[PDB]
A paper describes a structure:
Chikungunya virus (CHIKV) is a mosquito-transmitted viral pathogen that causes fever, myalgia, rash, and severe arthritis in humans. The E1 glycoprotein participates in cell fusion, whereas the E2 glycoprotein binds to cellular receptors and initiates clathrin-dependent endocytosis. Most neutralizing antibodies bind to E2, as this glycoprotein is more exposed on the viral surface than E1. We also describe pseudo-atomic resolution structures of CHIK VLPs complexed with Fab fragments from four different neutralizing mouse monoclonal antibodies (MAb CHK-9, CHK-152, m10 and m242).
Here, we report a 5.3 Å three-dimensional high-resolution reconstruction of the CHIK VLP. The trimeric appearance of individual spikes was recognizable immediately, along with the inclined positions of the three E1 molecules surrounding each spike. Further inspection of the E1 and E2 molecules showed β-barrel structures surrounding empty cavities, thus yielding a good indication of the positions of each domain. The E3 glycoprotein, which is observed in some alphavirus structures, was not apparent in the CHIK VLP cryoEM density map. Densities for the E2 B-domain were weak in all four E1-E2 heterodimers, consistent with the crystal structures of the CHIKV E1-E2 heterodimer and the SINV trimeric spike. The crystal structure of CHIKV E1-E2 was fitted into the 5.3 Å cryoEM map using the program EMfit to maximize the average value of the density (sumf) at all atomic positions, to minimize the steric clash between symmetry related structures, and to minimize the percentage of atoms in low density. Within the CHIK VLP structure, the four quasi-equivalent chymotrypsin-like nucleocapsid proteins were organized as pentamers around the 5-fold vertices and hexamers around the 2-fold icosahedral symmetry axes. The glycoproteins and the nuclear capsid were separated by a ∼45 Å-wide lipid membrane. The membrane was traversed by 60 × 4 pairs of α helices representing the E1 and E2 carboxy-terminal regions. Thus, the i3 trimers in the VLPs were more compact with a greater number of interactions between its component molecules than the q3 trimer.
Numbering used by the authors:
A (entry chain A): 1 to 393
B (entry chain B): 1001 to 1393
C (entry chain Q): 843 to 923
D (entry chain E): 394 to 439
E (entry chain F): 1394 to 1439
F (entry chain M): 795 to 842
Write the structure that this text describes.
Amino acid sequence: YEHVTVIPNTVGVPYKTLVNRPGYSPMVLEMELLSVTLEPTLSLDYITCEYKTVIPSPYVKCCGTAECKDKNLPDYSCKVFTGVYPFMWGGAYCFCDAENTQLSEAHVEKSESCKTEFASAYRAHTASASAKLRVLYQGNNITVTAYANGDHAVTVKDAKFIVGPMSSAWTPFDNKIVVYKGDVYNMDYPPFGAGRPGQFGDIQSRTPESKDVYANTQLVLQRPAAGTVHVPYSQAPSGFKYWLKERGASLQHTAPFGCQIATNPVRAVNCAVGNMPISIDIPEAAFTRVVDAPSLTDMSCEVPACTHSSDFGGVAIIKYAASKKGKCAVHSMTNAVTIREAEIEVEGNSQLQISFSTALASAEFRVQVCSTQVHCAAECHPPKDHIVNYPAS
Amino acid sequence: YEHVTVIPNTVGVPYKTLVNRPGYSPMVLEMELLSVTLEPTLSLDYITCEYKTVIPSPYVKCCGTAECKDKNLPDYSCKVFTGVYPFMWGGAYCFCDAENTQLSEAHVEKSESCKTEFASAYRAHTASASAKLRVLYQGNNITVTAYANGDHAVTVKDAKFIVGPMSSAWTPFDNKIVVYKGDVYNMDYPPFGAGRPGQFGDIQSRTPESKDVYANTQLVLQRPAAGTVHVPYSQAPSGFKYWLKERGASLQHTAPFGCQIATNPVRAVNCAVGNMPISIDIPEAAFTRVVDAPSLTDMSCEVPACTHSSDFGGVAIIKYAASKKGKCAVHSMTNAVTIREAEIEVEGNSQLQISFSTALASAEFRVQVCSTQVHCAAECHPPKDHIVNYPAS
Amino acid sequence: STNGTAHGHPHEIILYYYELYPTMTVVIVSVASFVLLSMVGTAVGMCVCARRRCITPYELTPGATVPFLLSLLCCVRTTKA
Amino acid sequence: HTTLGVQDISTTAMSWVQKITGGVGLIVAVAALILIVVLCVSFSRH
Amino acid sequence: HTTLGVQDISTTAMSWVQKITGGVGLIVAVAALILIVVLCVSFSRH
Amino acid sequence: LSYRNMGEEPNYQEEWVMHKKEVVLTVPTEGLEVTWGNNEPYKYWPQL
């Protein structure tokens, strides 16, 4: 027997459903969402890391002129300085006084760390559903973990479970995201080949192992000091190193609805929003004909104690007259009151104690025991605490 | 100097643009699209193949009863047949006449072929476009391959090229696709754990090397023949084998806009539709001041031959009077006529022959040679062919 | 938290505001205003109807006074001088 | 759970207040009709 | 490149036909005005 | 010291505590999550 039900996308709240197969005794199932996964479809634009300013030994031409060769390298910079007289350990390196030159060449490359220390620039398109949920089937708690697409079926205790498809459609991620180790940031990063010096994206590469790189660092060579062999330069500091200090809190801490952000793959776990359908194909092996059950007559409902709260703060005693010994289902016919007991045992002229939860001060509710209904009168009182540590219906 | 231009998304048609930097002599660039692939992500749902009905030796219990054991196997079927009297080579296998039983057990597994012969069920999300543009820069054809997002910059001959972003987003693939070897089908396949017998998805597995499998084949054991040892059964034939015969033509043959479908990884190649922008940052080293050019005067235009077609079916001779020897740009000031020549050489009292393409029968067009304009009168005739094998403006 | 006593009377009624709220009370107040308007409209209609009754006998000549008391407060005071 | 749009209890008390409103509306409606009736009587009298 | 919306040629001939239409419209417009003028003359005469 | 609401509007706030400090934080119906250094986040929920 296929049972279709819709529950809100709220983790930690137990929801009860009445399964009524015609000709068979009613069944009550308790369902609770333990966690809800939203995985977005990603497309890597580029990756950013620390840059390496590769500077070789300067070509000091004694008694002559050196010439710059235009090289096809990222951020390639070249300059020749006239009238240089450099000094070494044992004296002057050159013979001439003013007829010497120094060729200072430089270029920007990806640092050795880029394979380990890097930030990935992703473009989030669409996302999917998928999460797990528990359910008390036949007086035992069972764990069900499946994709919330409404296609992925999972069989637990000979019962087929179909979760989803998700009602919404909200995600904490934007159309452009940035991922560093275990932190995800909603960033409007610069496009590929449009990075600025000193900012996030000053060095852009396709993958941490990629060959060709983009570099905009504003590298300019300076004239060396008097009698000194060195390559002085003016360059904007690493944009990635600066961002790692001035990025702030990630989505894990800033996202609404209490979203938990996980990595590898990047997805949002536990997120309250919208509803979710759940189909349960209960086997006929767990059903019992009505005839095989008992009836009930003259019923009276007395409420000796009631406190309107999030938990079952109400106690109710129901008197009855049963035809025979058997199991009867207990369910509240009022949407404001919820019963803790799913099924109880009856015999003849006896009584039953049930725990109930309600929000109303004056509660007039109908309780369906087996196939017969009884009216309950209750005057519930306010609780001592205004704020509670657990969610309710 | 940054030059922004918009060309239609049409492969095989050359487009000419006039680059006019104030104070510098005009420049003509001929661009032509080469290709425009399209790759879209895809999350493998499952894989389907031929199934294997694993049937062991039947347990024939002579003078006794055999009992079925409930096994956790895909499509596990068990049955015990009473009053069996089987025969072998040397006579009867059992002593008793009617007190014998036969246990017939069966289950469905993935065939050995599943590693080789299989169809993959993918879920297509978003697509990433990648191409190829030919540019006649400084009398030489250059190849530019970049992402059409309007961010990925490529430098060829010291000129920065920015392609895109795309005007439009159409793909021949739907949200659900099926891939078999080199053929892609737009199929609305059944979800994981919801396959029907005899249909595509009767056997569902995560990967061709996966351990656990889903099976719905409608397998029922039958009673064996009189004095015969065999396991007769009724089962719906392989859904994958049936689909391989009744699938029809793939996307490669049915897709619009003349799409070519490639595999490993799947993606659409060659597709027209919409326009595309192109930004070219031409270096200042490829520009020449105007003061370093010449002029012209008195110019008559004679058209000895014209045939209105997709190609340059028109010939035009322009007479002139030049001040000095230099290069002058040739461009049609009429949007209906296109000139093959971008630049020519002038001297003094001479002439020039140019090739032109037009659609109109009566063509009155202005040709701008250097900085002076000339009126051309042409009476073009129809071509021999009604259908051509190359696109035009 | 915020206890929502029952009453009474009224009193507690306003206490509930804190419990489930922003709103609630304002809508009730609007309803009360509408009720007051209905009450006021009825009274205005009643006064016009009272005129409709005193009509005819609005010309002149003896004849109430008379039924002018018993007489819906005008009636009289009205008959007289 | 819980959380929802009323109205709800608390019965009795609730009825006490509700009963106070709308009665006067009925009164003025009846009075209006009665005034119309008398007006028609005058119209007939003329 | 052709593939555009007209109109275009063929001059002369084209003018021959065009000139035939609209002239009568001008005539009836002028006549209308003249009739109004005469009407005003009558109004003045009265 | 960092804190956020467990609802639609998280409103993340961060501060480096160095001296003796007393902090008063409002707890909404959805809940308030407070992280104090390297300790596991403390969850709080107001009672009716």
